[PDB]
């Protein structure tokens, strides 16, 4: 996490404009749609047979919101992500058995989601700050795997 002060301000300024409910739903839906293999973790969520079935699935929306909620909190502790994410890291490993690569796919998808939403506001340099951020979070979430 080599976030320069200016990168940190940029992450934070944009994050102010985000509707985590909404973005959470989109990022998670989109992940299940672009990398359908990731659907292996949600067989109890029902119908994910098509893009509309996924994007609109009430369970995907609710889970997305949860995930981004956790992510948002992470954004307030950019200093201590590993600490912030330790119990979650353990849970994903030991209980959920979630391959960590899934954390990196979600990060990229999220970056595309922020680009989609902010258009021109999501400048090359803003992207680079967010790239460092999603990577740090994915790393933090995989830190307790064994």
């Amino acid at each position: 996490m080599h976030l320069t002060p200016e990168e940190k301000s940029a992450v934070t300024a944009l994050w102010g404009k985000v509707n985590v409910d909404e973005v959470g739903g989109e990022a998670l839906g989109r992940l299940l749609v672009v990398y359908p293999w990731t659907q292996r973790f949600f067989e109890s969520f029902g119908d994910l047979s098509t893009p509309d079935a996924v994007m609109g699935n009430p369970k995907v929306k609710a889970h997305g919101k949860k995930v981004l909620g956790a992510f948002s909190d992470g954004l307030a502790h950019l200093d201590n992500l590993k600490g912030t994410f330790a119990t979650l890291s353990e849970l994903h490993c030991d209980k959920l058995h979630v391959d960590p690569e899934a954390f990196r796919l979600l990060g990229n998808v999220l970056v595309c989601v922020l680009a989609h939403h902010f258009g021109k506001e999501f400048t090359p340099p803003v992207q680079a700050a967010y790239q460092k951020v999603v990577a740090g979070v994915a790393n933090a979430l995989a830190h307790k795997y064994h």
Partner: peptide, 11 residues
Amino acid sequence: HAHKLRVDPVN
């Protein structure tokens, strides 16, 4: 592998 296992390609 594609429809059941769904192992991530990185593996």
